[PDB]
């Protein structure tokens, strides 16, 4: 009979882990009901506008790493200290700082971590002539993503009819500038993204993919994209835990458990979001528990062993639901062993308010235009230009 609403983006996977129903056992008294914008592009902006009038929030609101430090920054008084119904000790540290204030409120709850994996079709790497045990498909690369694009070269040499070796440009970007600890912010707080010489190289990079056709010309998280998931079009793709949300639903029947995941070339994150409670709604106090609740490690556990998102609270790792983790578009392969392994180096990142806007204008406004036919210095000085507009206005 009290109606708690969350506000999503993208595939968090609460709902589909069954933990919406676990909560109304526990509390009959609750009903749980979302709201979702598939992209956080569209997503963000709404949520800010929101925060700052007061008008059109849920009772919780899901935050994306890209974005948590200009919440913190700027939005912290309008939100629940959430420090006080969820646990310190049951979060990574690193992760419990992102959604913390200089005044020692932790106005947001960490959900899952992006360490970087690579996901395969094991169905058309063989079919081109590429191992498919995950083992032998990592040693392909380990270490260098040169060898990675070398990998999609072989890979397109005896490319089954309409495949590409990967899904898009703006992936493989995401991926290479995963395993930087300083990508766009450095530690005093500057953006750097135009004078990091990684930043640059990984676009020349992504570019060099791009020109020698082993990318679909497609952005990420639209539904031409969805499409080339549902039809097979590519045979791997940048696999950060929480991707796996996305290929096991836009992906057929068909496609379950011919999916498996290697190791990438280097340690890396991309992603990571939170939980956050505006203070002044009718449900607060609910809202602040069901967040808390949603957010622990039992929960957190469970997630990941149904939708493939993995936990910024340790004490899950040593649960079985991790150590035992399968996932339906990957068969037996053990998620939780390689999840864990792909975490193990993973980099404490240093974030900055206008990730999310960096991230976009690199992939959007940037590599994309190299799989629609421009140079890459036209494809970067769209970006910078774009991406400098965004930042100085
Ligand atoms: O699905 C849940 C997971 O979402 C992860 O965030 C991703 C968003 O879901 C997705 O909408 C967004 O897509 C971006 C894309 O990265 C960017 O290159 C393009 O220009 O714009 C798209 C639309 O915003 O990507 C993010 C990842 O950066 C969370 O990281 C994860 O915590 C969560 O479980």
Redesign the pocket.
């Known amino acids: 009979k009290t109606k708690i609403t969350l506000g999503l ?5 609460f709902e589909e882990s069954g933990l919406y129903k676990e909560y109304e056992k526990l509390h009959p008294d609750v009903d749980i009901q979302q709201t979702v914008v ?7 902006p709404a949520l800010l506008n929101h925060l700052t009038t007061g008008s059109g929030l849920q009772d919780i609101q ?1 935050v ?3 974005n948590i430090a200009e919440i913190v920054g700027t939005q912290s008084d309008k939100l629940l200290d959430l420090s006080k119904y969820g646990k310190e000790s049951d979060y990574l540290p690193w992760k419990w700082s992102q959604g913390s204030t200089s005044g020692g409120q932790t106005v947001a709850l960490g ?4 360490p970087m994996a690579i996901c395969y079709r094991k169905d058309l790497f063989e079919a081109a002539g590429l191992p498919s045990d995950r083992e032998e498909v990592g040693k392909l690369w380990t270490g260098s993503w040169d060898k990675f694009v070398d990998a999609g070269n072989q890979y397109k040499k005896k490319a089954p009819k309409g495949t590409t070796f990967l899904d898009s440009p ?1 992936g493989l970007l ?1 991926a290479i500038l995963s395993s930087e600890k300083d990508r766009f912010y450095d530690a005093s707080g500057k953006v750097i993204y135009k004078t990091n010489p990684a930043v640059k190289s990984a676009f020349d990079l992504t570019a060099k993919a791009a020109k020698a056709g082993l990318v679909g010309n497609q ?3 639209q539904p031409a994209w969805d499409t080339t998931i549902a039809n097979s079009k590519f045979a791997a793709m940048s696999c ?1 835990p ?1 991707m796996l ?2 290929i096991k639903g836009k992906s057929k029947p068909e496609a379950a458990g011919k999916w498996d995941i290697a190791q990438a070339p280097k340690s890396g994150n ?4 939170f939980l956050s409670v505006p203070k002044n709604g009718k449900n607060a106090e609910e809202a602040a528990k069901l967040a808390a609740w949603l957010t622990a490690p039992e929960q957190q556990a469970k997630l990941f062993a149904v939708q493939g ?1 993995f936990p910024s609270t340790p004490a899950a790792y040593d649960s079985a639901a991790v150590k035992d983790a399968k996932n339906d578009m990957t068969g037996d392969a053990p998620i939780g062993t390689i999840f864990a392994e792909a975490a193990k180096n993973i980099p404490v990142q240093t974030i900055g308010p206008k990730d ?1 806007i960096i ?6 406004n940037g590599v994309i235009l190299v799989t629609q036919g421009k140079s890459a210095s036209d494809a970067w000085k769209n970006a910078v230009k774009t991406i400098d507009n965004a930042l100085d206005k």
């Open positions: 983006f993208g595939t968090a996977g598939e992209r956080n592009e569209n997503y963000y899901m994306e790493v890209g959900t899952d971590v992006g703006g995401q952005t990420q998280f950060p929480w949300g996305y991309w992603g990571g979001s998102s999310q991230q976009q204008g690199l992939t959007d």
